[PDB]
């Protein structure tokens, strides 16, 4: 906004693991204020993911996140009728936010039956650079690299 009085809202950590990051993930998954439903989906997917990976719930989640977090993105800027995709650094909170949003979006277009299974499959795939979330991260990075010249805008 023009004035800038805008500051983090307090986020309660998820009950099972005490992770604020996981609570944000639940919020991103939630539809229509149905937080308990989203929590159940996330916990089921995390349990499946830990069984498949042997790591842990939180560690497997972090490993999936690291492969989807972007480092650079483009912001449009119109100059002479043409718009200049100017590559900018992505600050850490936005990296996490974009990664979780992309993971949820990718899991929602999967073909598996339950959303918990789709989410576990997406997290597993991202743990080894395979899912469409990792593909979106790669596309964002390549679009930013193609515009590396226009870094002063």
């Amino acid at each position: 906004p023009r004035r800038r009085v805008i500051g983090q809202r307090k986020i309660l950590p998820d009950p099972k693991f005490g992770s604020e990051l996981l609570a944000k993930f639940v919020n991103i998954l939630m539809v229509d204020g149905k937080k308990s439903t989203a929590e159940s989906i996330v916990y089921s997917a995390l349990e499946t993911l830990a069984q498949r990976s042997g790591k842990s719930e939180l560690e497997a989640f972090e490993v999936a996140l690291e492969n989807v977090r972007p480092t650079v993105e483009v912001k449009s800027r119109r100059v002479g009728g043409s718009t200049y995709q100017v590559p900018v650094e992505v600050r850490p909170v936005r990296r996490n936010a974009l990664a979780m949003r992309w993971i949820v979006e990718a899991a929602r277009k999967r073909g598996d039956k339950s959303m918990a299974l789709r989410l576990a499959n997406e997290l597993s795939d991202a743990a080894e650079n395979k899912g469409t979330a990792v593909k979106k991260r790669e596309d964002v990075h390549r679009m930013a690299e193609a515009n590396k010249a226009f870094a002063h805008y």
């Binding site: 043409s82 010249a149 226009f150």
Partner: protein
């Protein structure tokens, strides 16, 4: 083939492009690269970054000559004047002299008419 170890980097920095030619001290070209030939067209061609990539590529094109020392002649007002020299330095060349050789008439011929945009 022939080893030179002492060369000149000519940076033709125009508003639309940057040509980097590396010559021996007698003016014979050894290799060249341009911002326009380094995967940059249109708007991206005339940027300091495209000029930097052209400088890197021209430095690569003369690796076989074993050049170690570079005089730098800069010509033109383009955005690639400085970044080209920085990239030639980061390529490992010992830059021993930088000269501006931009042609200035001492009056000379009448320039083209002013654009009306």
């Amino acid at each position: 083939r022939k080893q030179v170890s002492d060369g000149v980097a000519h940076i033709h920095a125009s508003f639309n492009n940057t040509i980097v030619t590396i010559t021996d001290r007698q003016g014979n070209a050894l290799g060249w690269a341009t911002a326009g030939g380094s995967g940059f067209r249109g708007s991206r061609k005339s940027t300091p970054f495209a000029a930097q990539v052209a400088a890197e590529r021209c430095a690569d094109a003369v690796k076989e000559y074993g050049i170690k020392n570079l005089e730098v002649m800069v010509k033109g007002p383009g955005p690639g004047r400085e970044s080209t020299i920085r990239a030639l330095n980061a390529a490992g060349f010992r830059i021993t002299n930088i000269t501006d050789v931009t042609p200035i008439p001492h009056x000379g011929c009448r320039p083209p008419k002013k654009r009306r945009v």
